[PDB]
Specification:
This is Leucine-rich repeat serine/threonine-protein kinase 2. By secondary structure, the protein is mostly loops. It contains 3 helices and 7 strands. The protein is elongated and about 80 Å long.
Length: 266
């Protein structure tokens, strides 16, 4: 039930027991609070989706035993209770976009996909750095300053790191770079990047790099030629050390070109 005009509170009767409900969609209604009694009514719930609503307050502990896909996008959420996800040990795809969020409550160690785009962040909080199973992270359109190097993430399964439209100065990769050898998407567009460090050739599996619209790059390192898997590489609105986009330079030759400059360049 996911586009109707459901009123402020959607309290469920505490005396009904529906242990069969798996997916309870309530998006784009006019809720101003999370539904009241999910724990006592829908025990085996899996995908509680609540996007598009007007959820405002600091939420409740939400003691759901078998969640797998939370969703709180497009609400007006200021902050979550430090014990918000402290009772859902199975969450896998928490997503809170377009909110007004700044800090993260304890995230369970079972997170796999985690999207927090269009929020108002300042730094990737230490609660996301310590998720030993994280597998994707969309933190676009926040105003973060420092992207921690790969020696700070405690999870070897990074696959995607979207970080567009932030304000990122450096791309520190020198301390330890092979931990991100599985990263398959590193979107850094619209950032205040200055140079792309030469250790970025260690991300051998990098399949879609995106460093466009930086306006302060001026150079791709000759080490980037080792990214044999790249199939797209936007060059929009940044000036490099070569003249591309004739009819070719289709983000695959640029890797060959940058690779030939590694054998011997004159």
């Amino acid at each position: 039930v996911s586009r109707n005009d459901i009123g402020p509170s959607v309290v469920l009767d505490p005396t009904v027991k529906c242990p069969t409900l798996k997916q309870f969609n309530l998006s784009y209604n006019q809720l101003s609070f999370v539904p009241e009694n999910l724990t006592d009514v829908v025990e085996k719930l899996e995908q509680l989706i609540l996007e598009g609503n007007k959820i405002s307050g600091i939420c409740s502990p939400l003691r759901l035993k078998e969640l797998k896909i939370l969703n709180l996008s497009k609400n007006h959420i200021s902050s979550l209770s430090e014990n918000f996800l402290e009772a859902c040990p199975k969450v896998e795809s928490f997503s809170a976009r377009m909110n007004f969020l700044a800090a993260m409550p304890f995230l369970p160690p079972s997170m796999t996909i985690l999207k927090l785009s269009q929020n108002k962040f300042s730094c990737i909080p230490e609660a996301i750095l310590n998720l030993p199973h994280l597998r994707s992270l969309d933190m676009s359109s926040n105003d973060i300053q420092y992207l921690p190097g790969p020696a700070h993430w405690k999870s070897l399964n990074l696959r995607e790191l979207l970080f567009s439209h932030n304000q990122i100065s450096i791309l520190d990769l020198s301390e330890k770079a092979y931990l991100w050898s599985r990263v398959e998407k590193l979107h850094l567009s619209h950032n205040k990047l200055k140079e792309i460090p030469p250790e970025i050739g260690c991300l051998e599996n990098l399949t879609s790099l995106d460093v466009s619209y930086n306006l302060e790059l001026r150079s791709f390192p000759n080490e980037m030629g080792k990214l044999s898997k790249i199939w797209d590489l936007p060059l929009d609105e940044l000036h490099l050390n070569f003249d591309f986009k004739h009819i070719g330079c289709k983000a695959k030759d640029i890797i060959r070109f940058l690779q030939q400059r590694l054998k011997k360049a004159v």
